[PDB]
Paper text:
For all three structures, the Rieske [2Fe-2S] cluster is well defined and coordinated by two histidine and two cysteine residues. Structural determination of CntA revealed that the two functional domains in CntA (the Rieske domain and the catalytic mononuclear Fe domain) are located 44 Å apart in the same subunit. As such, electron transfer to the catalytic mononuclear Fe center is likely to occur only at the interface of two adjacent CntA subunits (12.2 Å apart) and facilitated by the so-called bridging glutamate (E205). The E205 residue bridges the Rieske cluster on one subunit and the mononuclear Fe center in the adjacent subunit.
The carnitine monooxygenase (CntA) and associated reductase (CntB) responsible for carnitine oxidation to TMA was originally identified in Acinetobacter spp. but was subsequently found to be present in a range of gut microbiota species. CntA belongs to a large group of non-heme-iron–containing Rieske oxygenase family. The oxygenase component has a conserved [2Fe-2S] Rieske center coordinated by two cysteine and two histidine residues and a catalytic mononuclear iron (Fe) center. We observed a head-to-tail α3 trimeric structure for CntA, with the Rieske [2Fe-2S] cluster and mononuclear Fe center at opposing regions of the monomer 44 Å apart.
Residue numbers in the entry:
A (entry chain A), B (entry chain A), C (entry chain A): 4 to 213, 224 to 240, 256 to 371
The structure:
Amino acid sequence: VEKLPEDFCANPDVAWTFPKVFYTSSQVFEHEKEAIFAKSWICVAHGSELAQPNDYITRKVIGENIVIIRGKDSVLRAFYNVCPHRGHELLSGSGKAKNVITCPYHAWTFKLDGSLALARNCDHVESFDKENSSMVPLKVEEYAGFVFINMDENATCVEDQLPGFAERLNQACGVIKDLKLAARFVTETPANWKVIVDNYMECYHCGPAHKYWHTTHQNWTLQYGFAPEFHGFWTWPCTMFNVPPGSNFMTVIYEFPVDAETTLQHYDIYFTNEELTQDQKDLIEWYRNVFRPEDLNLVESVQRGLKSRGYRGQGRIMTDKQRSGISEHGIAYFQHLVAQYHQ
Amino acid sequence: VEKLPEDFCANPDVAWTFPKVFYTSSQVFEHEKEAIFAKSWICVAHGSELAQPNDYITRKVIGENIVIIRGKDSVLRAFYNVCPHRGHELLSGSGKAKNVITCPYHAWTFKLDGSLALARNCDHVESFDKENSSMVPLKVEEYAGFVFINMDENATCVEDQLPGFAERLNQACGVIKDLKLAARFVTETPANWKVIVDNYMECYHCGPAHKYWHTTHQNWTLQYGFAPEFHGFWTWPCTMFNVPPGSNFMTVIYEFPVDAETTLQHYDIYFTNEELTQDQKDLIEWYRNVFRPEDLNLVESVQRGLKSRGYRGQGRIMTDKQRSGISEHGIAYFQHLVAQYHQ
Amino acid sequence: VEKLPEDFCANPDVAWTFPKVFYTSSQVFEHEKEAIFAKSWICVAHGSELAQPNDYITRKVIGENIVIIRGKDSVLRAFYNVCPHRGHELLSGSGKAKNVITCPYHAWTFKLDGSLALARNCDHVESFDKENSSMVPLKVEEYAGFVFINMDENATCVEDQLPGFAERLNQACGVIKDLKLAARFVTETPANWKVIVDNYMECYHCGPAHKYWHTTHQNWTLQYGFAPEFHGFWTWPCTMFNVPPGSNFMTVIYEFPVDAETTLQHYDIYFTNEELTQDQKDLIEWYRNVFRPEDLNLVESVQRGLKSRGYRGQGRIMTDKQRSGISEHGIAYFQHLVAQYHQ
Ligand code: FES
Ligand code: FES
Ligand code: FES
């Protein structure tokens, strides 16, 4: 019951952010949960976490607990982390699964491809089938050295969602296959997922709050320049890849929305060294205690302020004709794509 | 707006649990709160707690704070624990009331039968009546050595709800009158009340999670066998009585539902000894640290899992034709009775 | 969809409190939030906090974060505490602002009259105006030595809301201009704002819970007598001023409702001495540890009790014909005024 014009933010030069209801309303969220996050490829991890047989990880997004597991046969698969019998969760955290997944409730065992191996007493229950009593899968794809899932089984590949992205990311960082997760920050954030994307898409505050060109592509954008290149990739719907100068490491921001005003964030820092140099250990500390706190306070305060009847519905996107670094035109592009799911 | 067929689970051999909405929906809960828990006899305590004049207890169920009190005249009564003047609560916890109940707000005093004794300045207020300014009662019955309340004042007795139960319980345990509460575990549990009953009604997991026959009766069931007999009584709507081998003590599980995904549980352990033997003190510790944690984790994980779009609506009730101990047919009987309130 | 007769409580001699829904319902609250608190003068502070240039305070009411600030030019102003750019909050707590208000996000600066002074890069954004990019004001008035705001910009003055109040308050306390805030108690209270007003409007319990005449006026009442006079002012919608015997100090109760069952309360204690006498420091301790706890427990227990189906809808307002100190007739007057917004 809450819609937007199609030309919304099509012209970045004269554009305003969403009406406030799109940042706060439970009905806008449930629509986006089904129309966007249930039908789009969602990035969940770098490939290093899932590189070896029996390696698995677990993730929560839009209230779906997901397990991604590298099979004994080295095939990467993803399932809903819920037992098909009576609904117990199957696995927790991350690590190396064993050769079978045993449900902690009634001890049904599944192969690592989801196949029900043994369900106790099953051959004496009437009208039971081993198949169709399997763990329920969803699509998974390795792309650009990262791992994407999709809850729509008719989905086509990541490349159809992010045309050109993988080729450009490999041109930004040539050692992505060699990266290892050196630190992760988990934060449940009281801000709508679109508020967090807004913050990322702009460099109006890189100096008053923390050689610059922001170019839009098909469902992704890139913030590029020289500082020694630096890259900042935003990709639909909300995963950000940073390649700081030197191009030898990455940080990735994963957004796992929970509800209209809550978002789970993973802030991952990837280096190529197993043992960190002191420069890297110090850099992790600067990210945890300085940089990321400043960013989270910003979106939290903004989430509070925009509910106020004193915030007049929308806010002005500060685009300049020359598209300088402090131009907010990236926001306009993102909100235009979002408007397309609200016609 | 969420209904069920009448033959739902009438045939245990080919049966599935409820659609997931009945375990999660606030509208299913409010309907069950009024149609089931406001019109059924609810077990709240063993008779020992209320055996002496002025003994009282307090209980919370479906958001109703109840007081049960043995009158000075030795008559057992139950009232809503709310002052009829402006709504302050009257009593807290349990113990021995005094000869009058004095409201902590404006100090109206009531006899232990709810009769307003003194309301300050009342004879100068126009159109006031002492009677019809009393504490508001509800039905209470002592049955099977336990205490049952009912919020429907037109209710008939417990026996019409649980035909045969008291006779069978006395055949399971002959010293019920002599039992004393040796320990109580209070836990607010993030699981729908029907999930907790499901867990109790099955012995599919007594070995992989913690001479067996489960027979259904009129609104109650019994899990029976030899291990020296052992008994497990489920009674409508959700109170469970355990009589472990030796038949000399009992544990009782009381379920006081709060909302669609929350249930208050009392786990009571009753012995006949005032001073416990070391075997009993150790047994209380095994129940608190081992047994009950395992049970609560099970239902909590199940409550989370069944919301997942990966849990395909319902789950298969694993009944075998021979009705062995690991047969889940008890669940089918319970869900059939519940379906009867959702036509 | 929840209304009241107009003669509701017009006759204090035969009157009952509201039906329970008006104390609990989110729909009754949202209506009162817009019809009452968005259109009425709301008291927020004593004038001493805002007496000097650049002095400011912040307040939360009905989910609106407000800033009141004495301009460099000594003019008192109030604004919504939200940046007009993208919605960050501007200021926090209380104290002395600087000559400009700099938004912590993108560093737009505002004059202390809300005027946008500098918005970085603004002259290169198309169709931008400095004016109409200002902080959004609301009405503020100094009245009776206290500070009132109003969110309706077409409002007339406080005097039209509280006719006679300021003249009577100055007759109760002659040194209001000289008062200094000696202590504040902040408590988020789980009780509807109308429950807290009910508690204040009565002296049925001044003796069983903690020369007396309660006279009603236009939107305010006064509890008066000798104990050496004492005064107790209630004013619409919910601010209470106490002038204890000796008339040399005041306590003020501010009610900032949050939702149907939550109210933020400030309990302010004002003396004329900058350095407190031991009698005053002890009196602050008696208020914090004894008096106010008793009052907050009362309304919290009442909020719980009135939801119970055992509380029969309404409660009797105990008015006597002679209108003695323990007469509850003040409540009737307040609820009659409230009924006028629920026709
Ligand atoms: S819930 Fe997993 S085996 Fe029963
Ligand atoms: S609320 Fe119990 S006497 Fe007034
Ligand atoms: S939000 Fe205040 S300057 Fe951008």
